Symmetry: none
Subunit: 69 residues, 4 copies
C-alpha cells in the first residue's frame, strides 16, 4: 500500500483515506502509523519537494503514533 519516496529520512508512504491512517516506512527500518491524518496532509506530504522536511514540520509528534516495525 506504500508508494516509494525520496528523503534522506523515509523510504515509503502508504495512506488509507477510508480510515485516515498514514503509514510511513523509514530508511532506518522502522514503520510507524499515524492516526486521524487528513487527506491533504498526505497529499502535501507526497507533493513536497522534501518529504522528510514536511514530515517533521507537520506530522511528527502532532498525530497519534503507533509502531508497526
Amino acid at each position: 500500500n506504500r508508494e516509494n519516496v525520496r528523503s534522506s529520512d523515509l523510504k515509503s508512504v502508504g495512506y488509507d483515506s477510508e480510515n485516515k491512517i498514514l503509514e510511513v516506512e523509514f530508511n532506518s527500518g522502522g514503520i510507524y502509523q499515524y492516526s486521524t491524518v487528513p487527506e491533504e496532509i498526505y497529499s502535501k506530504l507526497m507533493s513536497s519537494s522534501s518529504h522528510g522536511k514536511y514530515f517533521h514540520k507537520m506530522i511528527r509528534d502532532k498525530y497519534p503514533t503507533k509502531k508497526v516495525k
Copy 2:
C-alpha cells in the same frame, strides 16, 4: 449552539462551520473536539437515524480528536 437529540448514546452536538470543527458531548460527561470536519459530515450526522451509530462509524477515529472537558 448545541442540541440534545441524544442518540444510541449521545448527549449534545455542536459545530463550527467557520472553523470546520465538530463538538460532541457524551453521556459519561465528556466533551470532545474534532478538527477539519467538513460541513455535510456534520449535517447528515444530524439527519441520520441514530447519530451515535453515525459518530461511531463515520467520525470516531477519523478526525483530530482533542479533549475539551
Copy 3:
C-alpha cells in the same frame, strides 16, 4: 461511462456512484477528486446548473470529504 463530460471554465467531466454516494469530478487542469456522502440530488443540481463551476464552489467544494485520485 465513468464520467460524463461538461462544458465549464473549471470542470471537465462529472460522474456519480448511486450506491456509495461518491461523486467524481475531473477538471480541465487535470485533477480528479472523489467526494463522499454526496446525495443524489446534489449530483443532479450540479449537472443541471447553468454554471457547474459556480454550483460546485457553492454547494460541493470543501463541504464533503475530499480525496485526490489524480
Copy 4:
C-alpha cells in the same frame, strides 16, 4: 468527568471515555499521553490492577496509537 488520581510510581491520574476509545494518562514525570482505540476492558483492568504501572507498561504503552497532549 476528570481524571481519577492513582497510586503508582510512574503515573498519577487516568481518565477514560468509553464511547470515544480515548485513554488519558498523566504521569509522575508530568506529561499527559492520550491513547486511541483502547477497548473499555483494557481501561478497567488498568484501574483494577494491583500495579497500575506494571500493567500500563506491559499492555497499554507501545500497543495503542499515542499522542502527547501536555
